[PDB]
Enzyme design. Structure first.
Site, PDB file in Angstrom:
ATOM      1  N   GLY A   1    -102.060 -19.276 -59.218  1.00 15.10           N
ATOM      2  CA  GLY A   1    -100.990 -18.302 -59.036  1.00 15.10           C
ATOM      3  C   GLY A   1    -101.305 -16.996 -59.746  1.00 15.10           C
TER       4      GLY A   1
ATOM      5  N   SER B   1    -102.027 -14.193 -58.516  1.00 14.49           N
ATOM      6  CA  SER B   1    -101.448 -13.067 -57.801  1.00 14.49           C
ATOM      7  C   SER B   1     -99.994 -12.761 -58.245  1.00 14.49           C
ATOM      8  CB  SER B   1    -101.429 -13.424 -56.315  1.00 14.49           C
ATOM      9  OG  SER B   1    -100.690 -14.620 -56.154  1.00 14.49           O
TER      10      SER B   1
ATOM     11  N   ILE C   1     -96.231 -13.809 -63.577  1.00 12.93           N
ATOM     12  CA  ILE C   1     -96.784 -14.402 -64.813  1.00 12.93           C
ATOM     13  C   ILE C   1     -98.292 -14.592 -64.761  1.00 12.93           C
ATOM     14  CG2 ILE C   1     -96.844 -16.432 -66.379  1.00 12.93           C
ATOM     15  CD1 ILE C   1     -93.762 -16.874 -65.226  1.00 12.93           C
TER      16      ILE C   1
ATOM     17  N   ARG D   1    -104.245 -17.773 -52.631  1.00 13.24           N
ATOM     18  CA  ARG D   1    -104.249 -18.471 -51.347  1.00 13.24           C
ATOM     19  C   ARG D   1    -104.929 -17.629 -50.271  1.00 13.24           C
ATOM     20  NH1 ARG D   1     -98.288 -20.261 -49.945  1.00 13.24           N
ATOM     21  NH2 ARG D   1     -97.924 -18.133 -50.720  1.00 13.24           N
TER      22      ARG D   1
ATOM     23  N   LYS E   1     -89.437 -28.726 -59.776  1.00 18.54           N
ATOM     24  CA  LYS E   1     -90.086 -28.562 -61.063  1.00 18.54           C
ATOM     25  C   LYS E   1     -89.721 -29.696 -62.009  1.00 18.54           C
ATOM     26  CE  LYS E   1     -92.135 -25.174 -62.286  1.00 18.54           C
ATOM     27  NZ  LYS E   1     -93.517 -24.644 -62.320  1.00 18.54           N
TER      28      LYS E   1
ATOM     29  N   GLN F   1     -80.734 -16.680 -70.854  1.00 19.99           N
ATOM     30  CA  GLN F   1     -81.779 -16.855 -71.840  1.00 19.99           C
ATOM     31  C   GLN F   1     -82.967 -16.057 -71.312  1.00 19.99           C
ATOM     32  OE1 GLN F   1     -80.851 -19.899 -70.012  1.00 19.99           O
ATOM     33  NE2 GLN F   1     -79.044 -20.319 -71.236  1.00 19.99           N
TER      34      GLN F   1
HETATM   35  N1  LIG Z   1     -90.320 -15.553 -63.779  1.00 17.10           N
HETATM   36  C1  LIG Z   1     -89.489 -16.422 -64.344  1.00 17.10           C
HETATM   37  O1  LIG Z   1     -88.230 -16.076 -64.836  1.00 17.10           O
HETATM   38  C2  LIG Z   1     -89.851 -17.862 -64.517  1.00 17.10           C
HETATM   39  C3  LIG Z   1     -89.114 -18.579 -65.448  1.00 17.10           C
HETATM   40  C4  LIG Z   1     -89.434 -19.897 -65.693  1.00 17.10           C
HETATM   41  C5  LIG Z   1     -90.486 -20.487 -65.014  1.00 17.10           C
HETATM   42  N2  LIG Z   1     -91.207 -19.787 -64.102  1.00 17.10           N
HETATM   43  C6  LIG Z   1     -92.302 -20.450 -63.390  1.00 17.10           C
HETATM   44  O2  LIG Z   1     -93.392 -19.574 -63.502  1.00 17.10           O
HETATM   45  C7  LIG Z   1     -94.247 -19.662 -62.426  1.00 17.10           C
HETATM   46  C8  LIG Z   1     -94.616 -18.221 -62.058  1.00 17.10           C
HETATM   47  O3  LIG Z   1     -93.553 -17.617 -61.372  1.00 17.10           O
HETATM   48  P1  LIG Z   1     -93.571 -16.037 -61.196  1.00 17.10           P
HETATM   49  O4  LIG Z   1     -92.184 -15.565 -61.471  1.00 17.10           O
HETATM   50  O5  LIG Z   1     -94.783 -15.383 -61.726  1.00 17.10           O
HETATM   51  O6  LIG Z   1     -93.586 -16.089 -59.571  1.00 17.10           O
HETATM   52  P2  LIG Z   1     -94.403 -15.158 -58.506  1.00 17.10           P
HETATM   53  O7  LIG Z   1     -94.672 -13.830 -59.086  1.00 17.10           O
HETATM   54  O8  LIG Z   1     -93.595 -15.383 -57.326  1.00 17.10           O
HETATM   55  O9  LIG Z   1     -95.784 -15.971 -58.514  1.00 17.10           O
HETATM   56  C9  LIG Z   1     -95.821 -17.239 -57.912  1.00 17.10           C
HETATM   57  C10 LIG Z   1     -97.239 -17.638 -57.527  1.00 17.10           C
HETATM   58  O10 LIG Z   1     -97.159 -18.861 -56.832  1.00 17.10           O
HETATM   59  C11 LIG Z   1     -98.187 -18.792 -55.874  1.00 17.10           C
HETATM   60  N3  LIG Z   1     -98.014 -19.767 -54.799  1.00 17.10           N
HETATM   61  C12 LIG Z   1     -96.938 -19.883 -53.976  1.00 17.10           C
HETATM   62  N4  LIG Z   1     -97.164 -20.863 -53.095  1.00 17.10           N
HETATM   63  C13 LIG Z   1     -98.361 -21.390 -53.372  1.00 17.10           C
HETATM   64  C14 LIG Z   1     -99.045 -22.427 -52.757  1.00 17.10           C
HETATM   65  N5  LIG Z   1     -98.495 -23.085 -51.738  1.00 17.10           N
HETATM   66  N6  LIG Z   1    -100.282 -22.739 -53.251  1.00 17.10           N
HETATM   67  C15 LIG Z   1    -100.823 -22.024 -54.297  1.00 17.10           C
HETATM   68  N7  LIG Z   1    -100.132 -21.006 -54.902  1.00 17.10           N
HETATM   69  C16 LIG Z   1     -98.916 -20.696 -54.431  1.00 17.10           C
HETATM   70  C17 LIG Z   1     -98.124 -17.380 -55.341  1.00 17.10           C
HETATM   71  O11 LIG Z   1     -99.393 -17.051 -54.857  1.00 17.10           O
HETATM   72  P3  LIG Z   1     -99.715 -16.289 -53.484  1.00 17.10           P
HETATM   73  O12 LIG Z   1     -98.418 -15.707 -53.030  1.00 17.10           O
HETATM   74  O13 LIG Z   1    -100.906 -15.430 -53.887  1.00 17.10           O
HETATM   75  O14 LIG Z   1    -100.242 -17.387 -52.602  1.00 17.10           O
HETATM   76  C18 LIG Z   1     -97.870 -16.604 -56.605  1.00 17.10           C
HETATM   77  O15 LIG Z   1     -99.105 -16.230 -57.168  1.00 17.10           O
HETATM   78  C19 LIG Z   1     -93.518 -20.573 -61.432  1.00 17.10           C
HETATM   79  O16 LIG Z   1     -94.060 -21.873 -61.571  1.00 17.10           O
HETATM   80  C20 LIG Z   1     -92.087 -20.653 -61.896  1.00 17.10           C
HETATM   81  O17 LIG Z   1     -91.409 -21.874 -61.651  1.00 17.10           O
HETATM   82  C21 LIG Z   1     -90.903 -18.471 -63.838  1.00 17.10           C
HETATM   83  O1  LIG Z   2     -85.152 -16.723 -56.601  1.00 16.22           O
HETATM   84  C1  LIG Z   2     -84.765 -17.591 -57.430  1.00 16.22           C
HETATM   85  C2  LIG Z   2     -85.700 -18.460 -57.980  1.00 16.22           C
HETATM   86  O2  LIG Z   2     -86.958 -18.230 -57.531  1.00 16.22           O
HETATM   87  C3  LIG Z   2     -85.319 -19.433 -58.928  1.00 16.22           C
HETATM   88  C4  LIG Z   2     -86.181 -20.435 -59.635  1.00 16.22           C
HETATM   89  C5  LIG Z   2     -85.647 -21.296 -60.636  1.00 16.22           C
HETATM   90  C6  LIG Z   2     -86.467 -22.228 -61.297  1.00 16.22           C
HETATM   91  O3  LIG Z   2     -86.099 -23.110 -62.277  1.00 16.22           O
HETATM   92  C7  LIG Z   2     -87.790 -22.288 -60.963  1.00 16.22           C
HETATM   93  O4  LIG Z   2     -88.498 -23.203 -61.647  1.00 16.22           O
HETATM   94  C8  LIG Z   2     -88.324 -21.456 -59.996  1.00 16.22           C
HETATM   95  O5  LIG Z   2     -89.630 -21.517 -59.665  1.00 16.22           O
HETATM   96  C9  LIG Z   2     -87.527 -20.527 -59.319  1.00 16.22           C
HETATM   97  O6  LIG Z   2     -83.995 -19.491 -59.292  1.00 16.22           O
HETATM   98  C10 LIG Z   2     -83.024 -18.675 -58.766  1.00 16.22           C
HETATM   99  C11 LIG Z   2     -81.711 -18.850 -59.186  1.00 16.22           C
HETATM  100  C12 LIG Z   2     -80.702 -18.035 -58.683  1.00 16.22           C
HETATM  101  O7  LIG Z   2     -79.448 -18.252 -59.152  1.00 16.22           O
HETATM  102  C13 LIG Z   2     -80.982 -17.043 -57.750  1.00 16.22           C
HETATM  103  C14 LIG Z   2     -82.298 -16.862 -57.310  1.00 16.22           C
HETATM  104  O8  LIG Z   2     -82.546 -15.872 -56.400  1.00 16.22           O
HETATM  105  C15 LIG Z   2     -83.329 -17.689 -57.826  1.00 16.22           C
HETATM  106  O1  LIG Z   3     -88.203 -20.011 -62.870  1.00 13.52           O
HETATM  107  C1  LIG Z   3     -87.060 -19.529 -63.061  1.00 13.52           C
HETATM  108  C2  LIG Z   3     -86.164 -20.061 -63.994  1.00 13.52           C
HETATM  109  O2  LIG Z   3     -86.490 -21.136 -64.732  1.00 13.52           O
HETATM  110  C3  LIG Z   3     -84.903 -19.512 -64.159  1.00 13.52           C
HETATM  111  C4  LIG Z   3     -83.894 -20.017 -65.129  1.00 13.52           C
HETATM  112  C5  LIG Z   3     -83.564 -19.213 -66.216  1.00 13.52           C
HETATM  113  C6  LIG Z   3     -82.618 -19.663 -67.131  1.00 13.52           C
HETATM  114  O3  LIG Z   3     -82.318 -18.884 -68.187  1.00 13.52           O
HETATM  115  C7  LIG Z   3     -82.002 -20.906 -66.977  1.00 13.52           C
HETATM  116  O4  LIG Z   3     -81.066 -21.371 -67.844  1.00 13.52           O
HETATM  117  C8  LIG Z   3     -82.320 -21.694 -65.887  1.00 13.52           C
HETATM  118  O5  LIG Z   3     -81.714 -22.901 -65.746  1.00 13.52           O
HETATM  119  C9  LIG Z   3     -83.274 -21.255 -64.957  1.00 13.52           C
HETATM  120  O6  LIG Z   3     -84.511 -18.440 -63.403  1.00 13.52           O
HETATM  121  C10 LIG Z   3     -85.324 -17.861 -62.463  1.00 13.52           C
HETATM  122  C11 LIG Z   3     -84.831 -16.772 -61.742  1.00 13.52           C
HETATM  123  C12 LIG Z   3     -85.673 -16.185 -60.810  1.00 13.52           C
HETATM  124  O7  LIG Z   3     -85.224 -15.134 -60.100  1.00 13.52           O
HETATM  125  C13 LIG Z   3     -86.955 -16.682 -60.571  1.00 13.52           C
HETATM  126  C14 LIG Z   3     -87.455 -17.753 -61.297  1.00 13.52           C
HETATM  127  O8  LIG Z   3     -88.733 -18.197 -61.056  1.00 13.52           O
HETATM  128  C15 LIG Z   3     -86.620 -18.353 -62.251  1.00 13.52           C
END
Ligand SMILES: NC(=O)c1ccc[n+]([C@@H]2O[C@H](COP(=O)([O-])OP(=O)(O)OC[C@H]3O[C@@H](n4cnc5c(N)ncnc54)[C@H](OP(=O)(O)O)[C@@H]3O)[C@@H](O)[C@H]2O)c1
Ligand SMILES: O=c1c(O)c(-c2cc(O)c(O)c(O)c2)oc2cc(O)cc(O)c12
Ligand SMILES: O=c1c(O)c(-c2cc(O)c(O)c(O)c2)oc2cc(O)cc(O)c12
Ligand SMILES: NC(=O)c1ccc[n+]([C@@H]2O[C@H](COP(=O)([O-])OP(=O)(O)OC[C@H]3O[C@@H](n4cnc5c(N)ncnc54)[C@H](OP(=O)(O)O)[C@@H]3O)[C@@H](O)[C@H]2O)c1
Ligand SMILES: O=c1c(O)c(-c2cc(O)c(O)c(O)c2)oc2cc(O)cc(O)c12
Ligand SMILES: O=c1c(O)c(-c2cc(O)c(O)c(O)c2)oc2cc(O)cc(O)c12
Lengths: 320, 325
Positions: free
Chosen positions: A7, A9, A12, A32, A158, A218
């Site tokens: 990931g 691209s 994070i 991908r 997840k 958070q």
């Molecule tokens: N941002 C947040 O608040 C947050 C919080 C908690 C946890 N996370 C976790 O952090 C990670 C990163 O999220 P992000 O916010 O950086 O999202 P993002 O900018 O949407 O990045 C997601 C990545 O997933 C890749 N991906 C999607 N489908 C795939 C597939 N089928 N095979 C291989 N790669 C694939 C995409 O790659 P391509 O589009 O290049 O294929 C992209 O690089 C996720 O696991 C998410 O659950 C994010």
């Molecule tokens: O777009 C959204 C999203 O991507 C995620 C999300 C939450 C997770 O816990 C993950 O692990 C994760 O990969 C994505 O939550 C959301 C929650 C909302 O209320 C509204 C949203 O639009 C998103």
């Molecule tokens: O991955 C994501 C994620 O974990 C959460 C999240 C944040 C919190 O603070 C929580 O309490 C919770 O339950 C989920 O939000 C998101 C919102 C997005 O738009 C996209 C994401 O990918 C996440």
């Protein structure tokens, strides 16, 4: 040493690659579609990318596709996650992908540690909110399935993937760490709008459908998070799941931080169903800090870095 | 409007993309391997690349591999050719895919319905490879395939592959009413954007490096500045009066004359003053660009310009040392 980042691209992933490159690792970044200029340009523009970054085409849906990328790696950072029928289009792929990458790690024989980016959605999705969450806490799958709130399938995907992965990790002496971020907010290197910034700047953009996640929010700064990732890879004392979260406050407090910083935007004063008696839910990062790790940024830093990057890229208007 | 460039990672192709993008074109660059950081980084860093550049994976050895990149294009620049490695099997690894891949691309252009003109970068090796050298070459001249196959001089397989590809292309062009133009560069010299050493600079800079294996190409030499060549490509794509083949060559001189210039500019290198088998009475052989200049094209660069740009770029990229002892 050589580390893989899936990931790369993403929001994070690309920031982590940047940091891993700056710290002097050799990085294998997986995408991908390597022909997508709008995603690989930003990778290939990072410092030391010419000499220390290689690109690798892989997809979580394709069994074995991470095999070659991981072979010869000392570390893997599994950040990628799949994004009409969620059970099969999102849930199963995520679990299988996850297992797929530990299988690929074992098949590699050289991986000393696998670091998985998990989600706050694995920790606090239940009907009653505790005042403080920690790493012993897990989301309520039956509440996800029965209520189907926004993003339920990502909560469920997840949670199930991380649990399935812990099974496997103990079985096969695969040394596994998990990091659980809350809402990740900061500047970014991509030219698309980070998904979590759609949620974080919802007070500004008025995107109601994102308020629920920040009603009791958070927060963590993207750079603190990537550092935490690398720290936990390196620090060999590291064990278990680690929450990575630096701030918590309810939406009123967030919106109020923003109004003062950004008079320029139409940031509302009150939100539906939110008393000032609403308690904030904290995600405790004590386990992480007790190891020694320290957070360098503040809620204000996060949203400044975000709003500045977003306007610079024309993703936010400069005022309303 | 949208055009395709094959072999966009290379010396000619990458500069052509840069100039095409600078002129407001939308470009589809093809590459064999888009994960190769050292081939694509120079492309993705071109101005307007984010908005007006896309990458596409294709290989001349794979049938129909250029179909998708080509569909939707108004113009195609076919610059790629199998010239990576010395081959123990030239017929199958060089000759075959050169001819077939050329044809396969013309077919792709047919199938695409939208291509108004295909521009093929040919080679001076389709023109003057024969035992006796004429004093001046022009577009009527073609290399001697029996001589090439008899002698098997260095690069014989590239002389043969391009000659047979272009001759096959012309046959197919007439039979299927395709607007086809060929451009025949002489040795291409100048600054560049790729990170590795351009193959033709290995040849061009051989009096400095002392790579005697390249001298026979420049014994009686002809040269064109890279940016002049790429300008000629664009000029010819756009100029509706363009027809047939075009030589693009701005200078000729014997190796003695080249070495003299390079000794004058670069006293810090050990450039020989003599070359075994070459005397001052040796005829220069000119490739005549009169057909191209008659259309209106004007060459901008000089021989000194070409060589200064090549030498400074090589130094800056650490591909040539700054001096000798
Ligand atoms: N941002 C947040 O608040 C947050 C919080 C908690 C946890 N996370 C976790 O952090 C990670 C990163 O999220 P992000 O916010 O950086 O999202 P993002 O900018 O949407 O990045 C997601 C990545 O997933 C890749 N991906 C999607 N489908 C795939 C597939 N089928 N095979 C291989 N790669 C694939 C995409 O790659 P391509 O589009 O290049 O294929 C992209 O690089 C996720 O696991 C998410 O659950 C994010
Ligand atoms: O777009 C959204 C999203 O991507 C995620 C999300 C939450 C997770 O816990 C993950 O692990 C994760 O990969 C994505 O939550 C959301 C929650 C909302 O209320 C509204 C949203 O639009 C998103
Ligand atoms: O991955 C994501 C994620 O974990 C959460 C999240 C944040 C919190 O603070 C929580 O309490 C919770 O339950 C989920 O939000 C998101 C919102 C997005 O738009 C996209 C994401 O990918 C996440
Ligand atoms: N340079 C000169 O002095 C000169 C003079 C006369 C004519 N020419 C002609 O100009 C053209 C380009 O030459 P150049 O100097 O730019 O050489 P170059 O730097 O080697 O570039 C040639 C390109 O061909 C591509 N290629 C090799 N095998 C291929 C295959 N099987 N399928 C698709 N592409 C393949 C390579 O791209 P990838 O490796 O990314 O796939 C490479 O970037 C050639 O056609 C040549 O005959 C050059
Ligand atoms: O490396 C060389 C090379 O690539 C070519 C070449 C010549 C052509 O006419 C082509 O059309 C072409 O694609 C390549 O000639 C050479 C001639 C030499 O004496 C020595 C070389 O090392 C090369
Ligand atoms: O493509 C090439 C090419 O055409 C010639 C060439 C130049 C002349 O000036 C001639 O008279 C001639 O017969 C061939 O040299 C080359 C040398 C390289 O190292 C690489 C090349 O690609 C070419």
């Amino acid at each position: 040493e050589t580390v893989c980042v899936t990931g790369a691209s993403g929001f994070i992933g690309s920031w982590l690659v940047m940091r891993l490159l700056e710290r002097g690792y050799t990085v294998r970044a997986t995408v991908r579609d390597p022909t997508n200029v709008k995603k690989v340009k930003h990778l290939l523009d990072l410092p030391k990318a010419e000499t220390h970054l290689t690109l690798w085409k892989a997809d979580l849906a394709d069994e074995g596709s991470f095999d070659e990328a991981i072979k010869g790696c000392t570390g893997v950072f599994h950040v990628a996650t799949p994004m009409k029928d969620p059970e099969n289009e999102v849930i199963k792929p995520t679990i299988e992908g996850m297992l797929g990458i530990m299988k690929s790690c074992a098949a590699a024989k050289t991986v000393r540690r696998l670091v998985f980016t998990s989600s706050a959605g694995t920790v606090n999705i239940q009907e009653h909110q505790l005042p403080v969450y920690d790493e012993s806490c897990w989301s309520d799958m039956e509440f996800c399935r029965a209520k189907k709130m926004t993003a339920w399938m990502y909560f469920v995907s997840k949670t199930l993937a991380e649990q399935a992965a812990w099974k496997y990790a103990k079985e096969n002496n695969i040394d596994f760490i998990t990091i659980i971020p809350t809402l990740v907010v900061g500047p970014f290197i991509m030219s698309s709008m980070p998904p979590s910034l759609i949620t974080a700047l919802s007070p500004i953009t008025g995107n109601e459908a994102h308020y629920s996640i920040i009603r009791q929010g958070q927060f963590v700064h993207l750079d603190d998070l990537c550092n935490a990732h690398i720290y936990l890879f390196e620090n060999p004392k590291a064990e278990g799941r680690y929450i990575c979260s630096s701030h918590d406050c309810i939406i009123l407090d967030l919106a109020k931080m923003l109004r003062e910083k950004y008079p320029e935007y139409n940031i509302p004063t009150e939100f539906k169903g939110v008393d000032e008696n609403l308690k904030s839910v904290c995600f405790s990062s004590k386990k992480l800090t007790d190891l020694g790790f320290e957070f360098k940024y503040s809620l204000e830093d996060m949203f400044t870095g975000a709003v500045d990057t977003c306007r610079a890229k024309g993703l936010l208007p400069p005022s309303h």
